């Protein structure tokens, strides 16, 4: 009451306190919250010297140091948050040029060491100079010695301290090797990961299965079989990309009369004319003799606008009477009318650069048995370069060249599976023909594609692989080498990674619920024998792929994406089961906290480890629904922003340099350097640079936004259109842990928003509790 404070306290201090209370109230603070805030503030003022300049600066920088605390809105338990943040500030950490220069020079020397070693080995070019028998004997004894040493290192019993020292030494060696570029470093990391994984598997098989309790024995056997399958998949993946071929283009003969004939096919079913016009314009701009290149548009819709465009620009056009077998049948029907020596296929969205056939056809003219060449449409890029080593690079459905006679001999493109490309590649490989892969960008057109496309491809591919295995099994076939079979089996296993993930999700609950000992070993040994496996696998995969962002978190992304596609893949051979599993995991957490606070202290550490495991599971499960709600959320369209210097010429003769921000068939939006009073509706000329040439395009300014100017193209001609498409499209072109935590949290939030109500309540309560707990977490 105001009277009680007014009579109890002198009017000045009472006015000050009531003013602070009203300031709190106006910001939504409750009476209880504001009273508690005043109490805490007066205690802090009487105890903590907030008048001191240090505390003055702290209060001035209050928002930076205490992001999660609202000073204007005191809340219950706010002093707890203040104490937590003060402890973090005391514990946390808040000649530099010379040290930075030394560190950078050391890193640069580490990076450049392979080149120096390569030069040193080049002057002593050199086994390779011995006889056949001598080389065989030396290699045999060397391999035997190295294998025996590796076997000893795998199967050596250790105590915790020696084991920890071993882990630290191997991890340091792997980290040092990872800095060195080259294929030898990748080979060393592959061998080291193999050794560590073999050690882990041997320990699991010989010292972790519990042979007393039948239930624990069965659970351990199932988990160990899942781990063995995962290890086999990892080894096969290492084999696939152990040695990327890095194929380079063979120069064509300088006699242009010896070059072959190429038929470019652009099949479309429902794509608008705007999409296909760019591809056709780029195709006409491909640097290749005109009499040796024929362009075909294959429209299944019978659309008359496409026919008009084909007649105008001169490219051929064929529409079928029927529409069976979709794209594969369309191309098969079109093949009956083409007469070229090679058949190239481009998708509507893909933009073929003018240096495509020049960089591709050299190998066809050189190696006779080569029947297929694939160009990139990261991980996929390197799996296809590694496959080329074993001659297992398969048709990806677009941006490929196929020799005409082998294609007609195998009965054309296969039509028995959804993935006609992979089946065509398999049939070509079965007859002894060879396939290649060139890692040279075309124009890549579409940007991002989002997970909507990512899932389209991921699924249509799994179903096709399953069908191919069902009908044209690589293992039971004839005429395929061992490495090609290994690559195909690796793809199938990658698409079959659904059951081990479920076993991994259910095992920690199989401990926490039934009180079993699926992994009969002390938790410290479990950590010391499992962590090196995952760390070395992550390091080796990061080095092989070379991704800029590389950690276990990218692997978590891969697992959550592949777990979202497990039900469709297994169907090829949601809400209810999934929320059931999530509730199972949360009940596991509850019984785990019960065990930890009331169970015997001997099993406490094991309980904690299983807690960590279940937390990882809860992250993955939320990620799977987060992607299910983020797959259909992309609304933006094709927008590529690249820097390219252009010129704008006015009617007055003034010429201004500009940089193009974005572009489309409707026109281009550019950023103009300097000040220019360009008025809308004024016809200007846009000069674009192609190599050492300049092409002038007449445009009219339709929108000006400050220095950003939008221009629209007047009705263009054919040659002008080709020049435009050549100058625009056919060009020469702990944080992650928090990100995954946010992904899981938002997935759980969406699950609470959209699951059945009977679990909507549970998930809403859980999300509220998680948010309240996170509100106390210290922040930098």
């Amino acid at each position: 009451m105001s009277i009680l404070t007014r009579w109890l306290l002198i009017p000045p201090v009472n006015a000050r306190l009531i003013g602070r209370y009203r300031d709190y109230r106006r910001h939504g603070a409750s009476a209880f919250s504001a009273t508690l805030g005043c109490f805490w503030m007066i205690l802090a003022w009487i105890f903590i010297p907030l008048e001191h300049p240090r505390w003055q600066r702290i209060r001035a920088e209050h928002k930076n140091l205490y992001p999660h605390i609202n000073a204007s809105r005191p809340r219950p338990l706010d002093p707890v948050r203040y104490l937590i943040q003060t402890c973090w500030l005391l514990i946390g950490a808040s000649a530099f040029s010379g040290l930075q220069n030394i560190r950078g020079r050391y890193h640069q020397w580490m990076n450049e060491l392979p080149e120096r070693v390569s030069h040193k080995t080049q002057h002593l070019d050199e086994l390779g100079h011995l006889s056949a028998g001598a080389r065989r004997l030396i290699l045999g004894i060397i391999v035997t010695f190295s294998l025996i040493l590796a076997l000893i290192c795998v199967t050596q019993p250790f105590n915790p301290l020696a084991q920890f020292i071993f882990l630290m030494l191997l991890w340091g060696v792997a980290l040092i090797v990872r800095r060195m570029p080259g294929r030898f470093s990748a080979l060393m990391l592959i061998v080291l990961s193999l050794t560590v994984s073999c050690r882990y598997i041997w320990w699991r098989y010989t010292s972790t299965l519990n042979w007393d309790d039948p239930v624990s024995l069965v659970c351990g056997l199932i988990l160990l079989f899942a781990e063995t399958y995962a290890w086999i998949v990892l080894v096969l993946g290492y084999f696939q990309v152990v040695w990327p071929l890095n194929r380079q283009p063979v120069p064509l003969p300088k006699d242009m009369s010896l070059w072959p004939s190429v038929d470019i096919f652009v099949p479309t079913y429902n794509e608008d004319l705007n999409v296909v016009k760019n591809t056709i314009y780029a195709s006409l701009g491909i640097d290749w003799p005109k009499d040796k290149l024929n362009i075909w548009i294959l429209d299944d819709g019978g659309r008359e606008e496409f026919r008009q465009f084909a007649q105008n620009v001169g490219v051929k056009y064929i529409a079928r009477t029927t529409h069976e077998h979709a794209k594969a049948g369309n191309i098969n029907n079109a093949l009956k009318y083409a007469k070229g020596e090679f058949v190239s296929i481009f998708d509507c969205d893909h933009v073929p650069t003018r240096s495509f056939l020049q960089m591709t056809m050299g190998w066809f003219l050189k190696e006779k048995q080569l029947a297929m060449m694939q160009t990139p449409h990261l991980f996929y890029g390197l799996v296809q370069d590694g496959n080329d080593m074993w001659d297992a690079t398969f048709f990806c459905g677009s941006c490929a060249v196929i020799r005409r006679k082998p294609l007609d001999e195998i009965g054309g493109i296969a039509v028995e599976t959804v993935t006609e490309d992979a089946h065509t590649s398999l049939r070509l490989h079965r007859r002894g023909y060879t396939s290649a892969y060139m890692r040279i960008p075309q124009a890549a057109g579409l940007a991002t594609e989002s997970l909507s496309a990512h899932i389209g491809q991921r699924i249509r591919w799994a179903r096709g692989m399953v069908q191919i295995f069902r009908l044209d099994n690589p293992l039971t076939g004839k005429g395929l080498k061992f490495a090609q079979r290994l690559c195909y089996v690796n793809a199938m296993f990658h698409f079959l990674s659904g059951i081990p993930r479920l076993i991994f999700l259910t095992a920690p609950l199989a401990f926490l619920l039934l009180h079993a000992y699926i992994i009969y070993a002390p938790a410290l040994m479990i950590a010391l024998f499992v962590l090196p496996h995952m760390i070395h696998a992550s390091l080796t995969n990061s080095k092989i792929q070379g991704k800029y962002r590389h950690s276990f978190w990218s692997e978590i992304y891969e697992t959550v994406l592949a777990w979202y596609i497990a039900p469709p893949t297994l169907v090829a051979l949601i809400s209810r089961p999934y929320i059931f599993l999530v509730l199972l995991n949360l009940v596991g957490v509850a019984v785990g906290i019960w065990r930890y606070f009331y169970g015997p202290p001997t099993e406490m550490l094991t309980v904690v480890v299983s807690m960590v495991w279940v937390f990882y599971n809860l992250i993955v499960l939320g990620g799977a629904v987060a992607v299910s709600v983020e797959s259909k959320q992309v609304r933006r369209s094709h927008r590529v922003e690249m820097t390219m210097p252009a010129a704008i010429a006015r009617e007055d003769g003034h010429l201004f340099s500009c940089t193009v921000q974005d572009f489309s068939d409707g026109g281009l939006g550019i950023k103009i350097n300097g000040q220019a009073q360009i008025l809308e509706g004024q016809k200007v000329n846009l000069l674009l640079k192609r190599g050492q040439q300049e092409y002038v395009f007449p445009t009219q300014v339709a929108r000006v936004m400050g220095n950003e100017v939008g221009l629209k193209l007047m009705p263009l001609t054919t040659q002008q259109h080709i020049d435009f498409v050549q100058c625009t499209f056919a060009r020469a072109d702990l944080e992650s842990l928090l990100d995954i935590l946010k992904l899981g949290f938002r997935g759980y939030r969406h699950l609470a928003e959209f699951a059945p109500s009977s679990v909507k309540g549970i998930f809403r309560v859980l999300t509220s509790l998680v948010s309240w707990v996170v509100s106390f977490i210290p922040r930098r």
Binding site: P12, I46, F47, I48, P49, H52, R54, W55
Partner: protein, 144 residues
């Protein structure tokens, strides 16, 4: 009114009181809590003028020295005046040996560590509040 601008706190004498607390815990000091409370009140009372406050501190420095001497078990100044002849009779080396024997370097190290701790903690904890609280507690225990 804005009289809080005149309550300047103990400031340096905080360390004085902390040192006396330390010497009282180890048993080297003969403590009179009432006089200590009187001295704390005398140094804590506000005076409007900066010159008056500074003069108060300068005058109280000899008073603080006298209180420290009284709290210590050292003989009174009259004994020193009476025995100055005997003190001067001794050689310089004997006096140096005697003072080195008297000097307890452990307490000097403790004093230095306390000075550093006070100069660091004066920015984070109001040492005047705690010193006054402990002094009142000692007075309460010695009275009731």
């Amino acid at each position: 009114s804005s009289l809080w601008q005149y309550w300047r706190g103990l400031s340096g004498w905080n360390f004085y009181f902390l040192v006396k607390f330390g010497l009282l815990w180890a048993g080297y000091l003969n403590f009179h809590p009432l006089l200590n409370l009187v001295f704390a009140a005398f140094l804590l009372m506000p005076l409007p003028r900066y010159s008056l406050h500074r003069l108060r501190h300068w005058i109280a420095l000899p008073i603080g020295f006298a209180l420290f001497w009284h709290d210590t078990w050292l003989p009174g100044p009259e004994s020193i005046m009476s025995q100055g002849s005997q003190v001067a009779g001794f050689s310089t080396d004997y006096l140096i040996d005697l003072v080195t024997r008297f000097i307890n370097w452990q307490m000097i190290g403790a004093i230095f560590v306390l000075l550093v701790a006070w100069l660091f903690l004066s920015q984070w904890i109001r040492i005047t509040v705690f010193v006054v609280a402990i002094l009142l507690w000692l007075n309460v225990l010695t009275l009731a």
